[PDB]
Amino acid sequence: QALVIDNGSGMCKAGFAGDDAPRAVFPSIVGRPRHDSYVGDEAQSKRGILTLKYPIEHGIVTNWDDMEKIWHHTFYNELRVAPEEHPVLLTEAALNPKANREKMTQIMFETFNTPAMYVAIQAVLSLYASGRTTGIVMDSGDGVSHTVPIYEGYALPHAILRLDLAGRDLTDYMMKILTERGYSFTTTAAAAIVRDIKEKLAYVALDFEAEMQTAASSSALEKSYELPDGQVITIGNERFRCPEALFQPSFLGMESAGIHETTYNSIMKCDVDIRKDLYGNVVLSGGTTMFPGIADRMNKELTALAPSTMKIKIIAPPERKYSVWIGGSILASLSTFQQMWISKEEYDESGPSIVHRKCF
Amino acid sequence: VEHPEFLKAGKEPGLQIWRVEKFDLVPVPTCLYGDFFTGDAYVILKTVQLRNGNLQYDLHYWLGNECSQDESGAAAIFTVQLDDYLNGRAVQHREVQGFESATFLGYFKSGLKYKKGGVASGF
Ligand SMILES: Nc1ncnc2c1ncn2[C@@H]1O[C@H](COP(=O)(O)OP(=O)(O)OP(=O)(O)O)[C@@H](O)[C@H]1O
Ligand SMILES: [Ca+2]
Ligand SMILES: [Ca+2]
Ligand SMILES: [Ca+2]
């Protein structure tokens, strides 16, 4: 019974290979006393008396002690397994530093005594979950966005682009513009409230200006939102302005190119002969791609960027919040996978550097 | 990959067809070649011998309109694995029911057929 763990900046997704969805989805947060530790929702609850930390920033592990706490909680508190008993599949960024891949491997075998493990690139897992071997993945989560072209099963590292604009940024931005509107989020639960408004009510405008006009001249786009205390506030143009910032990073004071352009830019970095299959297989992946309207808007923006005869297809599965996890489930389930694993035996033989030879 | 069906693949000119069945790669009986369960996903290997005598490989994964996610995912991954096993020499093609390429359609001399149903999901 292999396990599949997908570590993100904001959320850890975890489950059993062969299930169609993660069993456990919890915040990638470790809390330690201001004056012992806590993970996830519990850390968030006790946050008044804890220093809360995110071990993963922009998809990359920056704190191994706290990453260990995340995995310990994942095994013992969430999945309720003894990790010494299960092959474990973990996920990583496509350009995950070499030292980080080693440390993951080392921690797994030495700290948790996994009998087997494997590390897979998140984007590639999403492609596989969409039943493709070639395409471009636009993966947007809580802390980072990437455009990751993949040909015949493998990513093109030279062509990959990183955009440090994701969910947390969108949440902050929504807080700013609702404040500017006249609202005030002052309770401890401000970020969660505004994150929830984002996730429940935001959408991507097909035509941003035209939406701005519709919003300014009518009440038709307006939605009511009930706060924890029962106060009802109105969400107007903020609904589409917040995620507009994916297409217009200047809204956040970034000189960045938007997600559509980043995607185009990656495709253009690839050999001419594969671009047709990239344009025709643009897979959206991650929580921050869950905005209604996003795919249509991607399609429209890529259409305007590519020759007119290019076939553009955006693929946005409803379950793209967990695409990566689901690709791991599938991968780790194959009859062919028992030969892909790094075994304990192999690890004791070559140590952590085995990962560079076994996993890619 | 020690997968027994890998040992078999691309040995001589010809067409070889496997169906994904619960996270495994399972050969199709030769007398059912061309009759595809639209509820299933398949991996097809076409091995052609050129004028040289040289072996060429085109690897098609075919996705039924009603095949489950585990099935289309597995077909995609098996394809990559088989390509890797054949030293990356296979050209990979994604074949969607109702939109198969002419080359693929050409593999079945009496015309391919669809039939409803299939093997249950591995999930
Ligand atoms: N329905 C929704 N609409 C818009 N955004 C959403 C929705 N559901 C979740 N999100 C956002 O997605 C982010 C979490 O997504 P995900 O779990 O893919 O990120 P992660 O893997 O933790 O982050 P990263 O991939 O950047 O390391 C959060 O910012 C969350 O608010
Ligand atoms: Ca992620
Ligand atoms: Ca089936
Ligand atoms: Ca190949």
Curated annotation (Swiss-Prot), chain A:
Which reaction equations make up its catalytic activity? ATP + H2O = ADP + phosphate + H(+)
Q: Which UniProt keywords apply?
A: ATP-binding, Cytoplasm, Cytoskeleton, Hydrolase, Nucleotide-binding, Phosphoprotein
Q: Which residues carry this modification: Phosphotyrosine?
A: Y38
- InterPro entries reported for this sequence: Actin, Actin/actin-like_CS, Actin_CS, ATPase_NBD
What Pfam families does UniProt report for this protein, alphabetically?
Answer: Actin
Q: Specify the domain of life of the species encoding this protein.
A: Eukaryota
Question: Which EC number(s) are documented for this chain?
Answer: 3.6.4.-
Q: Name one GO biological process term.
A: endocytosis
Q: Which SUPFAM superfamilies match?
A: Actin-like ATPase domain
**Record localization:** Cytoplasm, Cytoskeleton
GO MF terms on file?
ATP binding; hydrolase activity; myosin binding; structural constituent of cytoskeleton
PROSITE patterns reported for this sequence: ACTINS_1, ACTINS_2, ACTINS_ACT_LIKE
Q: Gene3D superfamilies per the record?
A: 3.30.420.40, Actin, Chain A, domain 4
Cellular component per GO, a single term? pseudopodium
**Protein's job:** Actins are highly conserved proteins that are involved in various types of cell motility and are ubiquitously expressed in all eukaryotic cells. Multiple isoforms are involved in various cellular functions such as cytoskeleton structure, cell mobility, chromosome movement and muscle contraction.
Regarding protein family, the annotation reads: Belongs to the actin family.
How is this protein named in the record?
A: Major actin
Q: What is the lineage of its organism?
A: Eukaryota, Amoebozoa, Evosea, Eumycetozoa, Dictyostelia
Curated annotation (Swiss-Prot), chain B:
Q: Which residues carry this modification: Phosphotyrosine?
A: Y33
- Where a 1,2-diacyl-sn-glycero-3-phospho-(1D-myo-inositol-4,5-bisphosphate) binds, per the record, is at K109, S110, G111, L112, K113, Y114, K115, K116
Top-level taxon of origin? Eukaryota
Segments carrying the region annotation (Actin-severing) are 1-123
Gelsolin-like repeat spans: 23-105
Cite the binding residues for Ca(2+) 1. Answer: G39, D40, E71, V119
Q: In which tissues is it expressed?
A: Phagocytic cells, platelets, fibroblasts, nonmuscle cells, smooth and skeletal muscle cells.
- Give the start-end ranges of region Actin-actin interfilament contact point: 70-73
Q: Which residues bind Ca(2+) 2?
A: D83, G88, A90
**Which disorder is recorded?**
Amyloidosis, hereditary systemic 4, Finnish type: A form of hereditary systemic amyloidosis, a disorder characterized by amyloid deposition in multiple tissues resulting in a wide clinical spectrum. AMYLD4 is due to gelsolin amyloid deposition and is typically characterized by cranial neuropathy and lattice corneal dystrophy. Most patients have modest involvement of internal organs, but severe systemic disease can develop in some individuals causing peripheral polyneuropathy, amyloid cardiomyopathy, and nephrotic syndrome leading to renal failure.
Task: Share the domain note from the entry.
Answer: Comprises six structurally related gelsolin-like (G1-G6) domains, that, in a calcium-free environment, are packed together to form a compact globular structure in which the putative actin-binding sequences are not sufficiently exposed to enable binding to occur. Binding calcium may release the connections that join the N- and C-terminal halves of gelsolin, enabling each half to bind actin relatively independently. G1 and G4 bind two Ca(2+) in a type I and in a type II manner. G2, G3, G5 and G6 bind only one Ca(2+) in a type II manner.
Q: According to its UniProt entry, what is the function of this protein?
A: Calcium-regulated, actin-modulating protein that binds to the plus (or barbed) ends of actin monomers or filaments, preventing monomer exchange (end-blocking or capping). It can promote the assembly of monomers into filaments (nucleation) as well as sever filaments already formed. Plays a role in ciliogenesis.
**How does this polypeptide assemble, per the annotation?**
Binds to actin and to fibronectin. Identified in a complex composed of ACTA1, COBL, GSN and TMSB4X. Interacts with the inactive form of EIF2AK2/PKR. Interacts with FLII.
Homology family: Belongs to the villin/gelsolin family.
Q: What is this protein called?
A: Gelsolin
Q: Which organism is it from?
A: Homo sapiens
Taxonomic classification: Eukaryota, Metazoa, Chordata, Craniata, Vertebrata
